[PDB]
Structure formats: C-alpha cells, structure tokens
Design a protein around this ligand. Structure first.
Ligand SMILES: O=C(O)[C@@H](S)Cc1ccc(I)cc1
Ligand SMILES: O=C(O)[C@@H](S)Cc1ccc(I)cc1
Ligand SMILES: [Ca+2]
Ligand SMILES: [Ca+2]
Ligand SMILES: [Ca+2]
Ligand SMILES: [Ca+2]
Ligand SMILES: [Ca+2]
Ligand SMILES: [Ca+2]
Ligand SMILES: [Ca+2]
Ligand SMILES: [Ca+2]
Lengths: 173, 173
C-alpha cells in the first residue's frame, strides 16, 4: 500500500539512528526538487534544513522521527501543488502579488504588514520567492502558529512567556 | 581616523540604495572570513545572512543602515576574538565543552537546557560549531535578548504578546 512503502522510505532515509537529521533531509529534499524543474530554486541549504528540523522537533530528539517527518512531507506535497497552482505567470517562483493567495489557500490569513515582513525576509530583491524559501517559510509559519495556539488554549488572544521559554522558542527554529 | 574610514567602507559596500542587503553582507563576510583560516567554516550562506539582517533590521527598511551594520560589525569583531580565545584545542571550531565559556565571555549566561538546545540547532553531529554558525547564533541570541528586555522594561520576568507581535518577532528573524 501507500502507507506501507512510505514507512519503508523513511526507515531507509533515517538510517542508523532511525531519525532524519538536517543533512539527511537536505539531501532528499534537493534530489527530489530536481525532478520538478517547474519549481525554481537555488537548492535547499543546510542552514534552512536545520531550521525546518528544529521547528518540527516537538520531542526535542534533535532530529525527525517518523510522525514529524510524515507531517512535514504531507505539508510539502500540499504546499507544492499550491505553489504551482498560484504561479499563474509560470515564473517558477511566487511573486509579490501571487503570495497572498498562495498563503491563504494554504490556510494562513495574514494582514498587509505581516505579508510585507514575509516578502522582505523570504523573497528576493525583486519581490520573488523561490521554492526552498516558500517551503521553508510555511514550515516555520505553520509551526509558529501552532506554538502560539498551544500556549493560548484559553483563547485570550495573548500568550505570556518568561525569558527561558522565549529563548527556547525563538532560538530553536 | 578609524571611524572615518569605516564610514567610507560602509558607503562603498552599501552601494546604490545605501544600505547593506543580505547578498552584500554575505559577500563581504565570506571574502573577509577567508583571510582568517584559523576560523573554520563552510561559508556564510545566503539564508544565514538574511536572518542576521532581518534580526538586525530595527527600522524595518529590509536592510542594514549604517548604525545597524556598525553594531553588527563590532559584535563580530568581538565575538571573533572570543571564538579564537576559547578554541583551546585549535580545532578552528567551538566544541561542546568550549561553548559555555565562549557564550559567557560574550555576555550570555544560559542554563544546561538552553545550551543543549543551542548545540542541537547550531552545532554539527559531533557537537562542533563552525564560525558562520557561531556568529549567526550570537547575533540572533543577542537580538532575542534585546527584544525580550524591550518588551519587559517593567522587569516582571515575563512578556505578553498577541499573535501579530509574535509572528512579527518569530518570522522576521
Ligand atoms: O514527486 C513526489 O514524490 C512528490 S510527493 C511531491 C513533492 C515535490 C517536491 C518535493 I521537495 C517533495 C515532494
Ligand atoms: O580583520 C579584520 O578586518 C577584522 S575587524 C576582524 C574580523 C574577522 C572575521 C570577520 I567575518 C569580520 C571581522
Ligand atoms: Ca539519521
Ligand atoms: Ca524529533
Ligand atoms: Ca510567479
Ligand atoms: Ca532559495
Ligand atoms: Ca545595497
Ligand atoms: Ca534597517
Ligand atoms: Ca575547539
Ligand atoms: Ca556553518
């Protein structure tokens, strides 16, 4: 079945310690993104991969276990289609005007100010965002949203943290 | 004088828009780190440089103005000496056991748990941290500390933020 062979794929990629490290993730991500040329990218760099891993490392093993990796993979599959769908000009990248729809389709409703911050940090001098940047951003964004909600189950619209929780959440990303 | 020629150096590097972008920073950082072989590194990647810039972008111009760049440069100069000083085994990298002293000398007192998170995210499979990782971490750490203090001038040991401040602070880094 599908679930069957994916479980094997993970075991195979995880290797010796049975979890996927940043280096492992980076290698598989690159090799795969190469088969999809319609997704322009300068590649997944090691640093970007270390951020995605840490931000996905809920059990703080330093690496990705099966579920974490599964969560991340599905997300990438989904965000991958949304990327192509919204690249209406077939530039291979997500433009400043295509982004909002892309993010919203993915399920993230941001306001003008947040979108501008996103462009500034994850898009190029031309307001364009390649694929590794797009995926990297959504992973982090999705994770920051979840972190917020979990610390505000009482839904007051505000979370309160001491300096150690803060550093943990901001440095481990 | 010294202040005189540094002001020229910035103007020269900033170029057309007169601020230093991530690409500009990355180029100057690399070219410089090359003259210092005692500082092992696989280089400053574009993504790492985009994080340092954003985290240093207090006025949100998307790039580094003179003061921001000056602040960052002094820090690097200082953290650069602390790096060499504490690399007692002349490995060219900062080891798991040399880190605490290095960070503390720099002025950051963390606890066992925070140090472990740091190693996990910024050190290699061998618990080693190269120079671009070391500088990158301190810049972010220093910035996260400042962000916390500014939001807690009443010194209650806690800061409270809504979802937009949160996303701004976590995504723009
Ligand atoms: O072609 C595939 O295997 C799939 S599931 C879609 C996909 C496209 C790009 C990446 I990177 C990862 C996954
Ligand atoms: O040799 C120099 O110019 C100096 S100030 C120290 C330094 C060393 C490494 C970096 I990257 C930046 C600055
Ligand atoms: Ca592994
Ligand atoms: Ca994990
Ligand atoms: Ca496009
Ligand atoms: Ca990229
Ligand atoms: Ca410039
Ligand atoms: Ca600025
Ligand atoms: Ca050392
Ligand atoms: Ca490095």
């Amino acid at each position: 079945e599908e679930v069957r062979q994916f479980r094997r794929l993970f075991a195979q990629l995880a290797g010796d310690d049975m979890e996927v490290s940043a280096t492992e993730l980076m290698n598989i991500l690159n090799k795969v993104v190469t088969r999809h040329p319609d997704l322009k990218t300068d590649g997944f760099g090691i640093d970007t991969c270390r951020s995605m891993v840490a931000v996905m490392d809920s059990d703080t093993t330093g690496k990705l276990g099966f579920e974490e990796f599964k969560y991340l993979w599905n997300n990438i599959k989904k965000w991958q289609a949304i990327y192509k769908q919204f690249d209406v000009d077939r530039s291979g990248t997500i433009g400043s005007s295509e982004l909002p729809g892309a993010f919203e389709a993915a399920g993230f409703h941001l306001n003008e100010h947040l979108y501008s911050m996103i462009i500034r940090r994850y898009s190029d001098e031309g307001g364009n965002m390649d694929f590794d940047n797009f995926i990297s951003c959504l992973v982090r964004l999705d994770a920051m949203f979840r972190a917020f909600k979990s610390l505000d189950k009482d839904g007051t619209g505000q979370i309160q943290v001491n300096i150690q929780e803060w550093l943990q959440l901001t440095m481990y990303s």
